[model samples]
Structure formats: C-alpha cells, structure tokens
Target: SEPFYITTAIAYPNGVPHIGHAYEYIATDAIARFKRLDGYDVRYLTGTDVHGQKMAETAAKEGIPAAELARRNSDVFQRLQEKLNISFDRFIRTSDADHYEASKAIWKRMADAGDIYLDAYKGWYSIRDERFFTENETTEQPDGTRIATETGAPVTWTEEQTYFFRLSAYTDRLLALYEEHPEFIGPDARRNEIVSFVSGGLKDLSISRTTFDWGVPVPDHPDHVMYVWVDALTNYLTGVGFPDTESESFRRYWPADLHMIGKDIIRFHTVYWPAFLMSAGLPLPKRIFAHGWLLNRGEKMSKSIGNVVDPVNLVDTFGLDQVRYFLLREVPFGQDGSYNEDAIIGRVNADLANELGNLAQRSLSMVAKNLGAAVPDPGEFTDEDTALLAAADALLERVREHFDVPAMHLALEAIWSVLGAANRYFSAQEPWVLRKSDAAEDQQRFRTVLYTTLEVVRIASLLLQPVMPESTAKLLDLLGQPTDERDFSAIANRIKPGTSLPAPSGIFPRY
Candidate 1:
C-alpha cells in the first residue's frame, strides 16, 4: 500500500488544551481517517512540544521543576486527544528518549554539512516567542515598551554565544524551491507571504541557545541547548525513526505527505525547517498547510476574557459526532471562523436532527412496521428510481474528488445535497399511499421506494464515516452492513434484499 504520513504542529505544553488545539487535531484526524478508509497505509503524528522558555518560565512561576510541569501538562494534552477520539499513531513528546537521539542526529548532520558555526548573537529577543528580533522588526510603543512587529510580543535586548545555521547561504535555493514546487505551500495568501519573506533575503539562524538548560544539548557544546524550533520541528522525522534511514518505518513514512500547522508558524515550517532539511540532505514534506485560527464569538478566545472553550465540555454538551459535524461544516478550511451557540444548535437542528436524523428515523421506522423488518426488494426501476439511484451511485466519486481537495466541508455539502434529494424523492413518491392500494403493482412500488431510500442512506453513511465515525457506524449497522463492507468501495454495493435490519435508534437528539 502507498503510505500517507501526516502531522499536526506538536503543541507547546505550557497550558491545557483549548478549542483551537482541538480544531487542529480534529481536522488532521479526519484526514487520517479518510486516507485509512481509502486504503492507504497511514501514519498520523501529534504530541506535546515540551521544551521552551515558556514552559520553563511557567514552571518556575508555579514552583515546580520544568520536567514535572512538562509531564503533568503533557498528560492533559494526551487525555484531550483521547477525549476527541483523535486517531494519532504516536503522541510523541520532545522529552521522549528516542527524540533526544533523533534531534542530536539531525543537528550533527547539519553540522557535518558545515552549516553550523559558533557565533555571537546580539539582538532584541522575545521571551514569549523564544526567537530573536532585529531592530527593524520591533516597534517602540509610546509607553516605551518594545515588541516584535509581527507577533506584538515584548522583546528585551540580549546577547549570547550561539551556534548559527548558514541560513543566509540558502536564499536562492529556497526561492528556487518555491518556484519549482509551488504546491509545496498552501492557501495562496500564505505562499505569497513566505515567497516575499524569502525574497527579502535570509539571515543565518541562531540554532543554539545558552540561556536554556531544559532542552536537547548540542552534540559537542555541552553548555548550550538546541533552540526550541530545532528540537520541535524535528519530531516529524523522529516519529518514524529518522537517522535510521534504512529502517522500514523510515523508508515508508519519511518525507511526510503533509504537515498541518497553525498559520502563526508558517515561517518556521516553510522557511526554517526546509532549509534545515536541505542542510541535512533530507527530503521535504509533500505539502505544508497552514490553517486559520479559531475564534469564539468573533473575538480571539482567551481566558482573561473568560471565553475559552474546553473540548471536553463541548463534547459532553453536544454529542461527539454533533460537535465534529458542526465544526467542519460551519467553517471553511483555511479561513478563520467564529463559534456561536445559535449557529451550532442551528447546524445541529437543521442538518443533523431535521435533515439526516429525521430522514433515518422515518425511513427505518416505516421499514420495521410495514416491510417485515427486512430490506425491501427493489423491483425494476422507472426513470425516477434510476435517476435517484444514479445520483447515489455517483456519490463516491464526488466525495473522493472533494476529499482529495481536502475540502471536507464541501464534501459534506455534496453528500447532504444528495441526501436532501433522496428525502424529496421519498416524499414525492408517496410510498405510504402506494402501500394502501390492494393492487399488486402498488405494493411492489411501495417496496421499491423504501428500498431506494435505504440504498441512498447506505451510500451516504459510507461516505460520511470519516467525519462522523460513531454515528455513521451505527447507521451502517442498522442498515445491516457488515464491518468489512463499510469502506468507500462499499458505496457502489446496494443493500441486500431481505437482510433483516435492527431496530432504529435516534442518532441526533434535539437540544
């Protein structure tokens, strides 16, 4: 099987997971599930970024060891992933034993390539960002506060002995990479930003930090530690046994298929990481997608504003599948979206409850009562029946194209459009009236309508499995579909006639 490797930006475990974190995990996990259902060998990686000044400072303020704080907070993040049912293969921490080896190995590779050099670094550094800023990159506010122009984080002047990567040497090489692989970056806006940033010329990056004692140590320089970005970004390679290039895992999943990250760090992944890889002579990932931030009620979610959303609370309040459906369906990927109580409930009621759930309830209840609790025999079709069945048959292709675009919300819209049409066809046929007629033709037509409806549900269920796994699984089970017959390929196959269906249960309850 062809391999599909994907990852989310490893979260910095300085605090508990929030809705923004859950949004990334959910989107990435959905993609992973889609690849799996489509029969790809998939490796999904996500975890805590356990090192940095942020973690160290927070730990000090809390009167705890940085290592203990990392362990405690990392556990919260892991539990959040479990709660969301994120299908990550390895939840790696940068503090993991194997990760230290991987980080050191990559550092040595870049060093061996003569890209690493001992240099004195003097600049304005943002403790919040853990990166240095030049004089031109900072703005002095009227209060005499200095902050990074891009991030608006406060910066203080600092000088340190650091090892530098010859990033400035790769200016033309990176620009050429952008020209050669335009698809390497995503969402036109981000690509343009990176291209502009690189075109402005590059500077040798400070790769080692002497002030941090809680990080991966440089190979020979025992006093300094590897910078946070260097330690963190390498986890993608570490997830699959990098540096042991001969290992089967490395050969199979190395050079990741995609890296899903927040828009804030586009520079780190697009510019710095690739240049580092070029120095180490490793392959670049196929694609780097930077998605927009999630907002609550049109405001950036923050604890001080008392508006941060907890994923566990959201899931507990709404059904798991309901929250999943609402998030993807409400927001277009690559654009910032606001979450609202009214909007979520509206999607729940209009799409899930009224549209999908009611249709299932009505169709199955009728089948159980009037059709002997079995899949009705669908007789030879009219143009009406064939038109509906043709639409159902074409759904898998439509879904495949949309999923490949990674336009998940559009994919759901396509499926629901078919479902809407199926509902219309069911009503227009008036199967209930047909059932009352004593004539044999009317009875057969009645069975045909119900069978056609069930076929549409069966097809839609298979296509939606990735987005709403538990709900779709139950829907398929009620349709008498075997576990093995639930993949996308099964969409073309119709429900077996006379196969007994289980009693129906309401999947989406009203709020």
Candidate 2:
C-alpha cells in the first residue's frame, strides 16, 4: 500500500517559533500519525520556508548574511520539532541544494510551457503578507483603506521591472479545477472566498523580484531572485524528489495527501501551486487545506508586538501532552482560537491532571495496592460493570472515525464519558469495601470493574497518541507494554491477566 503524503506550511525560519506555529505543526503531525496508525502508508514532511523579505529582515537585524540566518533559524525550528516529537520523515530548508534545484527546475518548466514571462508591474505590496494586493483586498475605515494583513501597514503603489507568471491565463482553469475538485480548498467559507477572488480576476503574478536580495537567485538572471511563494512551494516537491516522480520518495508520497496551510497563504498554495504543477504537466496535490489563524489577547499573536507565547515555555510549565491536548481539545480545527492563561491552566488541571490522568492513576493504583500490582481478573460483572463496558466498547468504535475527520476533542470527550462511567461503577462496586469484607459477589464486581476500567484506559491512551504522543507513550510504558503493540484494535482484549504493571506515576500535575 502506498503511503499518503502529508505536509505542513513550512515554518518561516525568520524567527523563533511561537504557539501559533506550534498549533499547525502539532495538528498536522497528529493527522499524519493517525493515518499511519490506521494502516496507511504515511510520509510526513515539514521544515523551514527560510526565504523572502522576512529572512532578509532577520539577517539585517542580526547583522549577518540572510543565508546564514536562515540556516541558523532552520536548525532552531528542527530542534523544536524534535522536542515536540513532530515525526517528520524529511525536514526541508528552501536554501537546500535539492530544494533550490527543484525550484529552478519548476521555473524552467513553467517558462517552457509559456507560463513565465517578463512584465512591468505596479501594485500594493505588503512585506508582512509576502503578497501583492488590489484595492479590494484593503479594508476601508475612518482613516482610509488599510492593508488586509493584521500588520495593517498601508501599501503604496510601486512600479518595478519584474518577471511574472501567467496567473491570469489560469483564472478560468483554476475556477474549473476548483469546481471539479471541491475538496482541494477546505471548509465552505474558504472555497467561497477563493471562488470570489478568482471571479474578480487574477493579474500576472510577479514570480521574481529584481529588488529583493534575500531569495533564491533566478536560474539565468543574476540580478533577479525567485519569489517567496515559488521558493516555498518547491519545498514540497523537492523534499519528495518531484521531477523524478518514480523516485522512492516521490512514488511513495508525491501526490501530497494534504498540504495544511494558514488561510493567509491560500492564494499561493491553492492557486499558484496547482497552476505551477499544471504548467509542469504533473498531477495536482491531493488537497490544499487552508485553516484559520490563532487569536490571542484579542489579536493574532505576533512576536513583533511581544504578545506571543513561546511553546517551549508552556511545555516547561505544563508537560508536553497536557499543552498539546489542551490546544487541540479546546479549539475546533480550521477556526480561530484565542489563548488565555487562566483558561489553559484550568483545562490542564481539570481535564488532564484530574479527569483522565487521575482516573487512570488512581484506578490502576488501587488495583496495584489491593491486588498486588497486577491486573485483576474478572469472571463476572454487575449491571453497572456491564453498562460501563458497553459504553466503552461503543466509544472505542468511534475513536478511529473521530480521528479521521480530526474531531479529537469529540473523541476525547466520548472517552471521558466512559471514564466517568467506569469511575462511577468503581464507586458503586466498592472495591475497597469488598477487599475488607471478603464478600464473594462484591469481590467479583470489584474484579470486573477494575479490569474493565484498566483496559478502557489503555484504549483511551492509544487513541490519544496522535494528539499527545509523549504522554501516551509514557502511559503505554506504565501499563507495561511496548508502544508499538498498543495498536488501534488492541483494546478488544490485549491485556494479559498476570502481566506486571509499573509503579504508578503522575501523568499531569496540578497547576
């Protein structure tokens, strides 16, 4: 079976990563891991965009060459991915030889296809947005119409001799492509937005800049450099051996199963990317998914404004899984979410530290303490126990589906419903009272409740691996099982009766 291709919007390595960046990577990584667990071939690729005005600006600020700054920052993001266990099969940098070669190759192919030409263009350019805009892209207010980017910097008309890609020629083709492939642009609103934008019409897009010194140099023209989006998009193909489609990486995952991107970049990803592939006579990627931004403190978190949260800081304060879980569980994917310290702390303490974490910890600890630190065997069950088991079985059945559409929050909620039920069953069964009184029926009920809850917790932890790999892996280890053996269906009855369980450990601590 061929693996599905997956990619993240390569993090722009102009600066350190913040919570917003972490949000996208974690979400995409979760999806890729979910596919792999479901017995699909999965190639997860992510890395640094590492080019354009931002890279140049960062280099100027640091007083170094742009390339050097990109290299340093690319390494920084790679380390962050490692810390979070992002699980990328290949990490890309736009400056890498492979990426540059592929970018130039695509540019040449587009040129040969009559998709590239020189043009003198004038438009409103937003350096922050890495985009050019028309009058309509601006919002009118009391002062005047301002640029669409959150930066809100007003744009000025500037004319320059620049190379252009025949984007206008593809407007009809792009519209037809969208109509034909409804899934190419994600979510209803985004698809409509793209359709409206295309309806308005497209002009030739400037594909190379004569003025920017911090980008991939044009293949034949020394003074000109390739545009940011062109360089950035090439990372996907280059990472997987693009031109050589049958190259192992290409064959395994060339037709990207998904390209998860921020909504702001949808023009480049959904429009320019597919157009470029069309010019090259290659198949379009499986999907170009544009998800929304994260809002914090009533505005998008920006390091320039000093309103950003460093993901590592959060990880240090509240363990990795707790942070990951809170983000995914709280926010509906593809929508804007705000981060509040109080809300995050409350979720961690209430959900991870108390509900699921403590449920497993206390229940397993009780069994260990009373039943000699081994799984309790159940020969029969009370009605409460049977009810709990039925609920858990039903909940487990939906786990895969919830992850498929990525309603992990819903899946977790369902799992916790069962957890709460199991806890209630334990309380009613009175495992403590049974141990002291030695009643046969009570003992049978206690055994049934304990074994049922323990196995249920195992299933929950396995489902949780995609969203919270480290913590879930810790969970499997504590259960005295290798992480690999804890498969999706293992919840059916993989737990052996006499297997040794590890000493109890706290997975999430109270904040």
Candidate 3:
C-alpha cells in the first residue's frame, strides 16, 4: 500500500472545542479511516496552533503564561478528539520543541533561497502623516481607532521591521501550478476563487511579525518571530519529520496527500503555503480542501457570540456515532450546511433510524423469529435477489470513488441509496408474507429474500464502518460480520447461512 497522509488544520486554541473544530476533526477522521480501511498506509495528523498575539492576550485573561495556556488548552482539544474517536496518528503542537526546530528550519531555507528579507510592510494601516490618507479614504473613529471610511474596515498604524516572503514573485509560478495540477486545490468552486485571487496579484507577505513575542523566533535572529500562518502551517511538516528530511516518516509522508481544512483557511493553505514550499525547494502537499460552516448554512459560527456548540455536549447528547453521521450526512462537502436542533435530529432519525437501522432491525428480527435465530440458507437466486445483491456488491466501488475525493457525505449518500434499494426490495418481496407459507417453493423463496436483505444490510454496514464505527460494529455483530471481516474488502463477501447471531437491536434510536 502507498502512503496517504491526511490532516485537519491545527485549531486556534483561544476557546474550547466548538462546532467548526468538531466538524473538521470528524470529517477528516472519516476520510482517514476510509483510507486505512482500504489498506492505504495512512498518516492522520491533527493538533492545536497556540502561538502569536492571540495566545498571549488569551493567556493574560487566563492569568497564566502563554506556554501554560497552550499546553492546558491543547490537552482539552485532544480530549475532545478522543471523545469524538478521531484516529489521528500525530497530534502535533506548534509549540512543541521539534515543531519549533521545523518552523525555524523552514524559515532558514526560505531566507537562504533569497525569498525572505527584512522590510517595512505598509498596507491596511493608518499614518500620523495624513498625506497618505484623505477624509474620503479614511476617518478616525470616536474611540480613537482608525477606519477606512469607504469600507468601514478598521486599520492600525504599524511601522516595524520584519522579514517578508517573496510571494509577489510567485504569481506566474502559482498560476502555472494551478493550471498544471488542478487537484492541488479542491471542490472546483474553491479552486476558482484561489485562481482568481492569485491572478489579481500578490504582495510580498510579511513572514515574521515583530509585534508578537509568543511565537517561533526567526533562525539566528530572536527579535522577530515567524507569522502565525507560517508557524501554524509548519505543523503538517513537523508531524512527518520536516527538518530531518531523511527520517523514515518524512520520506514516507512528505508532500502529504491531503490537507483537510475549513473554509476560513483556504488562502493560507492553498496560496501562501504553496509559495512557501516553493521558496524552500520542498514539494507541496497534493490537495487542500476547505469545507464550510454548519451554522445557518454559510455564515461563520463563532465563540464570541455564543454560537459555537461544545462538541462534548454534542456527543453526550446525541451519542458519538449519531453526531458523526449527522454532520457528514447532513453537510455537503465544499459548501455550507444548515444546522439546528431540528436539523440534526431529523438527519439522524430519517437516515440512520428509518433507512439504515429500520432495515437491519426489521429484516434481522424476522430472521431471528422465523429462521431459528441464525442466517437462513439462501437456497436459490432470482432476478430480484441478484438485482439487490448486485447493488450491494457495487457499493465499494461507488464508495471508493467518492472517498477518493474525501467526500464522506457523498459516500454516505451512496451507501444510503443502496440501503434504500434494499428497503424497497424487502417491501416488494414481502419476506414476512412469504414466511407464512409452508410450501416447498415458498420456503425456498422466503430464505432467498431474507438472505438478500441481510446481505445488503451487511454490505452497507461494512461500508459505513469508517463513519460510524461503533454502531456499525454492533450492527455487524447482529449480522455476524466478524471483526476480521469488517473492512472494505469484506463488503464483497456474502454472509454465511446458519451463523449464530445476536438478537437484533437498533444501532440508532430515534431522537
């Protein structure tokens, strides 16, 4: 198997884990799990980025040093990851000693390549010299804040010596890269935005911030620290042994296959990130996808306004697998998803309970009472029987195609559609009605219908294991899909008759 590296963006740790963080972690985990189940040598990385002015300011509020705040707050997120069953291989911290080495090392590489140099950054700022601004272009707020009068956007007066990256020089290179490797960015719509943004123009980016002391300091120059974006983005490299490029992990996972991030950070990952890699003479990651907010569709969900939902509470209320399914099943990847108390409950009940769980429970409950508490002998096949099983057989291919895009929502939709077909088959076949007759052909037909229904349920369960591990495990247990036979490969094999099974029960109880 080839290496498949995947990661979620390191979260900003000013607050406890919220809905946005929860959504990213869960969705990334689903894809990582799929790769692993499909037998890829998957490396899943996730962590917190607790550097820059925000950490120091937040630490001041918490009455502790920035380092202490970072360490403590990062632990809370890791705890949330566990509660959500995130299968991350490395939870890299930007503040970790090795990460500091990696960050500084990358900075040194760019600087050596003549891509970084000290300069005065002048944009989006106010000046004591009113000559740089006019009453129409700028105004002073009553609270002494500077504002752009036309846009009502705020500005600050900053004149500091800092190192800048030569992003302005990479426009042509970036445009060419996008044209050559379209998969480097994702979801067509997002890639278009990045292309347009790059085509517009790029200014030399300020790579080091002299105003922030709580960050990775520049190599050989301790006065200036790397920008938050620079430091935070380096965590992906640090996870796979960046500075030690010869290390086993680095060789195997560098130029990572995917970096799964939220919409807020597409520019940093897709734009500045690739530019920095080119400057350092390192390979860029293969793909970066930006998913949207789950709050009122596309509007940003925030902690400041009490809009963020605590994942711990979400899990405790909905059950772990329920919460995972609700988000991935409800939210379309690469676009905003609506969420509310009603929305989640509806998705869980309609999809999980009605379509998936109901089929399993009803069919298998009939198996228990009618077939002597064991899988029935599928004595014969008919057009309807193979037709249903054929749909089940094709699930892996369908799921694999969508999962390669790392589109878990689509994958689940494909799985549920098969479940829908199975549900329709069960109704039309009326295996329960067939159970009433004791004639030879009717008994044969009864066993065949039950077998076909169970096989479809079994296939759906196996395909869904990556998204809903625990519930699928229990469902597989009821269907007698052994732990060893629950991976994607097992979906093609049929469940054997006369295998003893546990009493049928619903994995999803309607909320």
Candidate 4:
C-alpha cells in the first residue's frame, strides 16, 4: 500500500515554538509514521511560514531585516523537530524560490480562470492573528469590549488598491465542495461551524496587500504583494510541484493526502484553498484536518502574554519518546486540551515506564533466567495461552481501522486493554510454577506462556511505532528485531527459536 501523505500548519517565523506547535507536529508525525508502518509511502512536510506582519514586526523590534529574522527563527523550528524526533520528509520555508515560483504559477492559473480581479478593499485586520474580521467578530477585555480588526490590533477602516480572489462568487461552489467532501474538515462541530459560515455568506477575499512590502509581490505589480495567507497556503501545492507537472515531485506527491492544520486557521484551508484550486482547474487535497489548540493550564499559550510553553523544555526534562507518548495518549487530537503536569507525569509513570515498560522488563528477564537469554521454544500451546494470544491478536486487528481515522486515543486504549488482559493471563497461568514442575509437558506449557507473552509484546511494539517511535523501537530491539522495515507483515510470524536477545534496558525511565 502507498504511504499516507501529510503536512502540518507551517509555523510563523516570529518566535520560538510553543506547546500548541509541538502538539500539531507530534500528532501529524505520528500519523505519517503509522501509515508508513501500515504499508504506505509517506511524505510528511512541515516548515515555517516566514512572510507576514508578525515576521516583519519581530524583525523591526530586533533591528534586523525580515529575511534574516526569518532565517534565524526557522533554525529554532528545525532544531525543535530534531529534539522531538519528528521525521518530516520535507521541511519547507515559504520564502524559498520553489514557493515563490509555485505561488506565481498558481496565481496565473487563478487569473486565467477569472478568479482574480482588482478592487479597492477596506477592512479591519488583525496583525497578531494575521486575519481579517467582519463587524460581527468582537473582543472583550476586562475594562471593555469592542470590535477591532482581525489581529485584535485596534484598527480604523482603510482602503487599499489590491487584487482579490473571487471567493464570494464561489460561495455556492465552496458549500457544494463541503457537501461532497465531508471529511475535508474533521470533528463534526468544526465541520458544522465552517458550513454555517459559508451558508451565511462569503465575501470576495483580499489576496494582495498594498500596505505590506514583506510578502510575495503580486505577479506583475511590485507595489502590491500577495497576502501572507496566499503565500503560506501555496506551500501544499509547491511541496508537490503544483505549477510544474513535469517535475518529479509533482508525480510523486501531488494532491496531498492530508493538510493537518490548527482550528484557528481552518477557514483559510477548507474554504480558500479549495476555491483557488477549483478555479485553477486542479484537484484539491484529499483531506483538510483542523486540530484544536493546546492550552497552558486554562489559558492560551502566547509569547506576548507570557504564557508560552516551550516544547524544548518539556522534551529536555522528559525524553522525546515520553513526550510524544503523552501528546497522543493524553489528548484526543483535533480538540482543545490543557497541559497538566501531574497528568503528564502520571501517564508517563503508569503507562509507559510502568505498564508497557515493566511488561518488556519482566518478560525479557524471565526469558534470560529460564531460557539462558535465548528465545524460548514453545512445544505446545495450552488453552490459557491460546486465549491470551487470541485476545491480543484481536485487539490489534480491530483497532487498526480506528487508526486510519487517526484515533490515537482509541487505538492505544484498545492495545492497552489487551495488555492488561495478557498481564492477567500471566498471573493466572503462573509460568514460574510450571518452570519447576520438570515434566516435559509442564515445561512446554511454561515456555508457551512466555512465548505468547513475548509475541504480544512484539505486535504491540510495532503498533506503538507510530505513536512512540523511539521507545517502541527500543522494545523491538530487545526482541532481537529490526527497527524499521516499512511494513507490518513481519509481525504475522513468531520470533525464531533460540535467537539471542539484545541487551535489555529500561525504555521509559520512571520520570
């Protein structure tokens, strides 16, 4: 099977990455890794959106050019991914030549299709949010509440000579697109929110900005440049060689399988991106998954507000695998979630270091003691052993589909259920007692129990690769197995008898 293609919301190159950024990276990274294990050729791309008011403003504050600021900050993003063990196939920056050329090509196509037109536009914009807001959207402070521009940077109406994408003309087209592609936006609530917004109305969207000299210049007009959203959204197409079909990348990864983005930016992805593609006579992406925010305690994590949760701090204190495990295991992706230190520590200690970790420890220790650190040979399977193995096999089989939906919590829970059951089976079978009986039949039963337990561990380790790639690989190494084979077919068989066990080590330290 071909691997699943995926990408995350390109982080704006204005500051260090916060917890929200890490959550998106981990979730999308896990999905890509999972699909690869499920026999798919995965191309996961993540990078920085380096053009916008935020970047320019930060540069001005630091007394540097926007480009230099972007380059320096983008390095932080790359380092963050490395620390977290996020295996992205491509890390793209929107300011790259590839992106510029691709954006120009896409603009030309949209122009030819009559989606581009000139108009004097006036609206309130939010620099912080990098968005536009209508009269209905308002903000309330403790002192008072008022409707500001999109970024919540108070603004007065002003007009600019700029170009627009015929978004309003495609109101019906977008609604129809949504109807046809229900999975384009995930979480029923989010889908409904977008649907309602489109049903109410869509205005012609401003694609070019006259006030900003920091973005991709409007095709032939140096005075007018493309808006940040226009430039950023083009990354999906640029990543797969949108304008140049002759490019090898176009053939390899066009029509991306998924666009994993944040909830705050869902409209731009679901509504605007498809409309642009439709006008360009191009096929839209397979799915647009909008994930929610990662809150610090009960408030939003923001640099300005001094509530930012640096991901590096978390990964440094707790190992990368442990952090990755907690991200997908603790929260249901695509919804609002908070970081509770106790909750994280509890899950790490109980789930990774204790339950799954101890399972590997006990089983490997027993094999070392009873079978001289060699893979035990099972003579025959007892009824108890058969039942335990059946439970584990069934769990992995049943939960695989939910994983397609990328339901990390449900899938992990399913695997853990079987783990708990297997632990119970170990207690009831009492493998230690059978070891001392000496009768050949009794000893065979003991080895069968141990073998069954080890088999379950092997299969579970494969499943965990998508969620906790490093830790799971550690477990697989202890089983004397290859770390990365790009498929799950190897799990269908048993470990060869008498294979030497690798040196065992505690995977998730009790942190």
Best by TM-score: 1
**Evaluated with lDDT, which candidate comes out highest?**
1
> Candidates sorted by TM-score, descending order?
1, 4, 3, 2
Candidate 4 yields a Cα-based lDDT of 0.81
Q: Report the lDDT of model 2 for residue 81.
A: 83
List where candidate 3 sits over 4 angstroms from the true fold: 123-144, 147-155, 296-308
Model 1 residue 343 CA deviation (Å) reads 0.6
lDDT values of the candidates?
Answer: 0.88, 0.79, 0.84, 0.81
* Predicted structure 2, TM vs. truth: 0.92
Worst 10 residues of 2 by lDDT: 299-308
Q: Compute each candidate's TM-score over C-alphas.
A: 0.97, 0.92, 0.92, 0.94
Q: Candidate 4 has which clashing residue pairs, if any?
A: 2-40, 2-41, 3-40, 3-41, 125-150, 126-150, 126-151
Report each candidate's C-alpha RMSD, comma-separated, in the order given.
2.1, 3.2, 4.2, 3.1
Q: How many angstroms is residue 455 displaced in model 3 relative to the true structure, after the best TM-score fit?
A: 0.5
- Write model 2 residue lDDT over 1-511, tens digit each, in one string: 5588899988788777877778888888888887777678888889988888867877888899988988888888999888887989988888788787888888889999998888787777776667787776666667765565445766656588888888889899999988988878887678888899898888888888877777889888989998898888888899789667668888777778889888878878888889889998778897777656666664435433234377877777677787788888887777777776666788998878887888789777977788888888877665766777688778656877776555666777877787777667666666667777667877776776678778778877877878888788888887777655866656676567777888888977897
Clashes of each: 0, 1, 0, 7
As a TM-score, model 3 comes out at 0.92
The parts of candidate 2 lying over 4 Å away from their true place are 135-151, 154-157, 297-308
lDDT of 4 at 155: 40
Score residue 496 of candidate 3 by CA lDDT.
Answer: 92
Higher-ranked by lDDT: 2 or 4 = 4
